[model samples]
Target: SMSEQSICQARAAVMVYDDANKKWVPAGGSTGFSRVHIYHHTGNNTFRVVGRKIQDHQVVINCAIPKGLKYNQATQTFHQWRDARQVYGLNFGSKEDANVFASAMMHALEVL
Candidate 1:
């Protein structure tokens, strides 16, 4: 419970895909992209993304060995499907970095 495994830290924009409108809305607020850290716990089968937030530190993005992860090479972003109506937009800086994170996520999933 005290151990942690780091995945990667990359600059990205966080957004949520609205199924009804088919649009992406910013996670925290109307701001620009920033650095995001992705990591996991050694004994836990979950991956987490930590980003910027001002209204307290309650902005941790948790994905549990995600099975609905997709990467868009054209947009250089990764889409995480939370459900039928919710999707997460993890807009990375580049395709290379996005792929890196995807691989790291898969690696952690495998370990889990």
Candidate 2:
């Protein structure tokens, strides 16, 4: 079981999504992209996302860092990269959600 501090921290940020994370089961180690995880913390932002199995979710190649991703406020798209070239990115279920996630990512990068 997770410690009290760990439990509180893990459940903090108002958890943008949970049922999905609780229900999702891929394979092997870890994985997905069905819901956006935008946890807004007081310290350095985590700049992390979850759910949206474009391919194999657990695969490392699917990892997208906040430093490399840029969210379009107008269009609600998270601009990303593959190695060096820029690539079209994910479109959120809602525009503001993307905004929160993107802004959080940037904030995290700055803190880093």
Candidate 3:
């Protein structure tokens, strides 16, 4: 589960499909097309995030951010590059579960 502060820091927004303009728009950002992420705080003190990068009527599923994972905004993607060993305190039952969640999120992006 996310701490109260963590939940509060996490933000929610949407990507709207615009038929007339034929583009996806961020709910509030200046970019008409941008990325969107949906995060679920599991009861086990972790978060599962699904990300989709959308632009010009196309949506590409990126990847999921597992529990205790933090993103690197500069890369506009998950910081999976960092060694998991160096990152402490994350509590995923198994690495397989984390990968599965990531795959599911990518599938969602493809479908949407």
lDDT of 3 by residue, 3-86 (tens): 311211111223334457866544334333233344444444333333332444333322334533443222222223122432
Better of 1 and 3 by TM-score: 1
Query: TM per model?
Result: 0.67, 0.39, 0.25
| lDDT by residue for model 2 (4-109), tens | 1110111111112123355322322233343434343334433343333334433222233455444444455433323243232344445565665566556655
Candidate 1, residues 71-108, lDDT tens digits: the string is: 34345476454644456677776776677766666665
What local distance difference test score does each model get?
A: 0.61, 0.37, 0.33
Q: List the residue pairs that clash in candidate 2.
A: 32-51, 32-52, 33-51, 33-52, 33-53, 34-51, 34-52
TM-score of 1: 0.67
Model 3, residue 46: what's the lDDT? 36
Which 10 residues in a row give candidate 1 its minimum summed lDDT? 53-62
